[PDB]
Write a protein that binds this DNA or RNA. Structure first.
Ligand SMILES: [Ca+2]
Ligand SMILES: [Ca+2]
Ligand SMILES: [Mg+2]
Ligand SMILES: [Mg+2]
Ligand SMILES: [Mg+2]
Length: 350
DNA sequence: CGCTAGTCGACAT
DNA sequence: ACGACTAGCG
């Protein structure tokens, strides 16, 4: 999630209702709904007590989309991305920190802060995700567990034409090149749509409305695959690109100290880190539901060697990928928690 | 004055 | 895997 990205391109956003896509198909970043629903039962989840509320909290949104005549596809986060290892590690450590801070120092001190610390230590497991999957499937709703980050999977489904819109609360989806992104959607179906084509309607952006340039902006503003330089947020990220007359991004990143009149000594780790982040946004491994194959988000260009993109996701066998995608194989422990098969028992597969 | 990083409440009841 | 509010810096 990029800080201040909403306001920056506010002019490319319009308030809609889900009924706009009646008869059409939307894909959902379900982990957001899960994180939002687990809040109402953070205590039981922190203390390891059995709870089943988040499932209902997802199924009500599902029932709403279904009621307004939408075909939803629920996409789930899968294996942890190596390029995102640092950020995810940070989230892990913060989760453990809040978990301890509540569980021990608030069970005997003050109980009012206990729920607050518990809510800051919520960790969406694949088990819970599988509860939601079981429910949705029982109500006839297709599901898909991304090989890695659901961002890339959703972006793929939109760019491939399988879905026309994507429901999420994560603004990262734009940097991935999604056509339409529905944000901040409430219980009844009122949210903020963001069309990619409308990005040109933003004063502050300038000529940074193209996919590549917008991607660059998002990356060097600060993301989950690479932290920004100190003192550089969205505005200066945009200004650098606006003032850049040179097509090559590397030379620009090198002369970033000259463009902004700031004292910036750019390291090489930030250069190669930038290349890594770009390659992550471009070719992160997703799952093709039709062909049942693990593919890069975009087809590999001429200036990229696939053997060096280990951080963008590891290739596994197509059968293993298919089993992960069906939610049969647990992400954390790699065991067959289920044996669901789509061929037996107009779906995504076949 | 524009802008960035960092804190703390809402997130959903 | 959030965002309003703002103190402080260039
Ligand atoms: Ca409408
Ligand atoms: Ca895997
Ligand atoms: Mg993010
Ligand atoms: Mg995500
Ligand atoms: Mg993201």
């Amino acid at each position: 999630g990029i800080q201040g990205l909403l306001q920056f391109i506010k002019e490319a956003s319009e308030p809609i209702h889900v009924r706009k896509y009646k008869g059409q198909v939307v894909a959902v970043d379900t982990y957001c709904w899960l994180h939002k629903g687990a809040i109402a039962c953070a205590e039981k989840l922190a203390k390891g007590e059995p709870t089943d509320r988040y499932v209902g909290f997802c199924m009500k949104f599902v029932n709403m989309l279904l009621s307004h005549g939408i075909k939803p596809i629920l996409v789930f986060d899968g294996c942890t991305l190596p390029s995102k290892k640092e950020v995810e590690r940070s989230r892990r450590e913060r989760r453990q920190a809040n978990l301890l801070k509540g569980k021990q120092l608030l069970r005997e001190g003050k109980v009012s802060e206990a729920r607050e610390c518990f809510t800051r230590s919520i960790n969406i497991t694949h088990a819970m995700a599988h509860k939601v999957i079981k429910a949705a499937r029982s109500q006839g709703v297709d599901c898909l567990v991304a090989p890695y980050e659901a961002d890339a999977q959703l972006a793929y489904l939109n760019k491939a034409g399988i879905v026309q819109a994507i429901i999420t609360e994560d603004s990262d989806l734009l940097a991935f090149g999604c056509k339409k992104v529905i944000l901040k959607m409430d219980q009844f179906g009122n949210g903020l749509e963001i069309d990619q084509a409308r990005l040109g309607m933003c004063r502050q952006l300038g000529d940074v409305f193209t996919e590549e340039k917008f991607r660059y902006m998002c990356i060097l503003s600060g993301c989950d695959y690479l932290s920004s330089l100190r003192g550089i947020g969205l505005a200066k990220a945009c200004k650098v690109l606006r003032l850049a007359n040179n097509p090559d991004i590397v030379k620009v990143i090198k002369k970033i100290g000259h463009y902004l009149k700031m004292n910036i000594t750019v390291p090489e780790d930030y250069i190669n880190g930038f290349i890594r982040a770009n390659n992550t946004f471009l070719y992160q491994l997703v799952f093709d539901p039709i062909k049942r194959k693990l593919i890069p988000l975009n087809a590999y260009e001429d200036d990229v060697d696939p053997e060096t993109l280990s951080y963008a996701g590891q290739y596994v066998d197509d059968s293993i990928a298919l089993q992960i995608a069906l939610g049969n194989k647990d992400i954390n422990t790699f065991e067959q928690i289920d044996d669901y098969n789509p061929d037996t028992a107009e779906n995504l597969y076949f």
